[PDB]
Structures are given as C-alpha cells and as structure tokens.
Design a binder for this molecule. Sequence first.
Ligand SMILES: COc1cccc(SC(C)C)c1NC(=O)N1CCC[C@H](C(N)=O)C1
Ligand SMILES: [Zn+2]
Length: 139
Amino acid sequence: SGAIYVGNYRVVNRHLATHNDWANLVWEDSSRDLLVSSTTAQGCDTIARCDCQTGVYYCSSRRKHYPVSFSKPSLIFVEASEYYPARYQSHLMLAVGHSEPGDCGGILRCQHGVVGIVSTGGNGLVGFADVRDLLWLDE
Ligand SMILES: COc1cccc(SC(C)C)c1NC(=O)N1CCC[C@H](C(N)=O)C1
Ligand SMILES: [Zn+2]
C-alpha cells in the first residue's frame, strides 16, 4: 500500500484505489496502473522533473529503503493477475530489488523528488509506475 500526496491530489495504484478515490476521480489509466483523486488537504510531497535512473525506494515487506538503478519508462509485458488481464503496462521502470505482493504504492525518490510508485515485481525485480511526465500534478 501507499500513495503520493501533492497539492490537492492523491496518486495511488489504480488496482488499490478505494471507493472514495473513485468518487473523487481526477484521472486514471489502466495501462499505467495509476489513479489520481482529489483531496481537501494540501499534500506533503513534491514531484521530480528529471531523467534520473537511480534513486531509493521504500519496501514495506522489509520495512526498509533500498537504493536502485532503474530502466527508463517503457512498455513492458505484465502477466495476468486478479486485477488485470495479461497486457503491456506503459511508463513502467524496472530495477533489481526485493518486492512482494503488498509492496505496491511504496515511493521511489531521487534527489529531485518523487519519481514514482511500486506497481509490479517478480523474482528479485521491482517495477515502478513513473509519474514525472504528469506535469499537471504541480498546478
Ligand atoms: C509488487 O508486486 C509484485 C511483487 C512480486 C510479485 C508479484 S506477482 C507474483 C505472482 C509474481 C507482484 N505483483 C505484481 O507484479 N502485480 C500484481 C498486482 C497488479 C500489478 C500490475 N501493475 O499489473 C502486477
Ligand atoms: Zn532526479
């Protein structure tokens, strides 16, 4: 679990969005596994606007942060789950690092701010949904 709170927006994994997220929907994209809902309170986070390919992510299944080198946002095949059919997920960045089901939503940060959130994983891999191209989050 986990979310980004920036301005009057809450960014979550689309597959973990709540009834309240859908009732206050701003934007969603199943191909990216992202959903953004509106909030009444001002957020605590800021978003990176950069091309960093290294950073640090929070891994809830270890209660720890780990450093990672990750690929540029791209279209990657993701196997069927209870949440989605087999498909290509876009704007996804892969890295070597621990992740399990439950780790989705953990934040990836570089020196410039929030880069994205955990969205997929596998046998020693962790994948992140990028948010750096969503310029409207800042206004
Ligand atoms: C952090 O997520 C994981 C980590 C290790 C393993 C796993 S599936 C295990 C059966 C190999 C997963 N789960 C996932 O990759 N997803 C299930 C939830 C939806 C995700 C999506 N964006 O489509 C895909
Ligand atoms: Zn950066």
